[model samples]
Target: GPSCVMDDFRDPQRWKECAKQGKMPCYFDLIEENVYLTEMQCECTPLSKDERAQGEIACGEDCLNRLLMIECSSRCPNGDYCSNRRFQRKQHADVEVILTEKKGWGLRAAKDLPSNTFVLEYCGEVLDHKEFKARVKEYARNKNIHYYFMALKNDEIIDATQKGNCSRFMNHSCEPNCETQKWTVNGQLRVGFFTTKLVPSGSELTFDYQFQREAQKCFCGSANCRGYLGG
Candidate 1:
């Protein structure tokens, strides 16, 4: 394991030594899923697509060893860390953001969803002051990372992070199944959705990614597509 990986653990050596001591690692009982990354590998450190392509999932039988090999020194700034995994939505989860090959965004149900509905409560840090500047500067420095930011409070993107979640992954389409709204739960960013029209089940989910001024252009093949596609 490299130092970049160990620095994130509360007790890296203890965790390591205990593995062969008696019981297996904490992840010993867990199965691999995309929802949560195991702490055995610096809880919030997301394995890049490239890293994953090289096979470093944090929740499988080999996770413990992979955790050991992760370079903990490269943890997120200021004691903050994030994982690539997300909690899986239950069946019939309220449609939050929709993904489509035809469009850049998707929609959500407008009415209150019943059981298993899916909505998003932004759990990431609200970058403040110096941190905001640092992120922006870093974006400029690294052209590789998509610098997009969304005001989960407004369903509008202030700027975007090219290095984040599926917000950047959504393609665009004119006929979408979801809608967007800014939601706040006691002042935290929570994204909401309103079904512009009733959507039947098994349809590919979709929504527009932008709802702000100076938006990005949508070049997707949607017939009536707005130029700035995002969410």
Candidate 2:
């Protein structure tokens, strides 16, 4: 439960941390994750009196809000005890960034984590498909080294290469211990990483970069490593 925040990646003194890792550590604006230019989708009004009567058990498997992929708001009658507010509270598991021989830098669990535990949110600039195509070409134009991208519903892409969290450091695996989940926090959709199985302390966290297209090479050490990252 080590509390990690966006500020942990911010640098008021400048992007000195990024500069240290590469030959060209370009400066990027740090902004809260976004909804782009679209109007806010919907507000989660409080539960009805009848549902309020089930207060102690609100926001569960059968929770309409959860079933609808909505994160419970603070105004939820369950209040602080709301079970579906994991993303709302920014709950994340402790993780450390470490360098590996095959995988440049990878994410590691700082503690033994139960299966399906939320690890961290994949923070980045949101982009529609049009922007994503242009940016990918632009990045290739320069030897920026890595592409921190994640695919979402509607093929909406998350560009995290420049504005990502430690989660961006994750590498791909043929068999991975972690996977992603998307939810609507407030209204905008967001993605979070979750452990697919019990992960012991110090285990490297990985998921299929879905490169079905990794354009890059797969360095996942699982006995199942496909030798090449992308098919």
Candidate 3:
């Protein structure tokens, strides 16, 4: 295995290595199914005649539904070959969680990745704007060091503050190699992290935090350092 790949361990070995201070131990969670709290807003309908025009590489790149950020249904005529269903199919590249100098825990790709590769889905407990606001306020008052709250839409939010996957381990970069894209999947919304540039193995994975508010300071260390993390 590569140095990067070694950081990603499977099961008992991972649990044993959880000692973390380089010791032994535990953990994990992932999000499946789109509907969490509220009613699903989208539907996975059969493709229109035009949608089926793209054959072989069905539901891919130029697929109508994908263009609109909507994933096709499992029962799609394209069936197993549909490319627009990455989110639904749970297609993910193998990435590793590792330590970083300035960013603490970080995620890295275990192998070379091409531009536009879907790396992972950012998931956590889904909540409404009402709850998200309260929690954000609470964390602020407490001066909490870590929190991973993201918006799926205006009313829908993904609060990874407590539950999430390796995606939450992703750090910020002034010149991010990855980008978050929204897609309607399984009748709800999902945010997938994709590579905007060809990334080499062992390079730290990053995406612009693009915070909506004053988001502390920036340590991205890029030549064009913005000095802060905000829009």
Candidate 3 local distance difference test against the native: 0.73
Steric clashes per prediction: 46, 2, 3
User: What is the per-residue lDDT of model 1 for residues 31-108, given as tens digits with 9 covering 90 to 100?
Assistant: 112121221333443455676566654343333322343322233321212221122221124333433333333333
Q: Could you tell me every candidate's TM-score relative to the true structure? A: 0.38, 0.78, 0.80
Q: Among all windows of ten consecutive residues in candidate 2, which has the lowest summed lDDT?
A: 37-46
Q: How many residue pairs of model 2 clash at the backbone?
A: 2
Better of 1 and 2 by lDDT: 2
lDDT of 2 by residue, 1-231 (tens): 122333445764544554565421344555446445453222334455687676745466766777777787776756766778887677888887666676566778888999888888888877888888888889878867767877776758888877766778777889988888898886778898989999999888888776433266666666867877655
Model 2 residue runs over 4 Å out of place are 1-32, 35-58, 212-214
Could you give me the TM-score of model 1 versus the true structure? 0.38
TM-score of 2: 0.78
Model 2 scores a C-alpha lDDT of 0.71
Q: Which stretches in model 3 have alpha-carbon errors above 4 Å?
A: 1-30, 33-35, 40-56, 212-215
The sequence of per-residue lDDT tens digits that candidate 3 reaches over residues 106-163 is 8788789999999988978888888888988998898877668777887888877666
Candidate 1's C-alpha runs over 4 A off are 1-119, 145-148, 152-175, 186-189, 211-219, 228-231
lDDT of 2 at 62: 69
The best candidate in terms of lDDT: 3
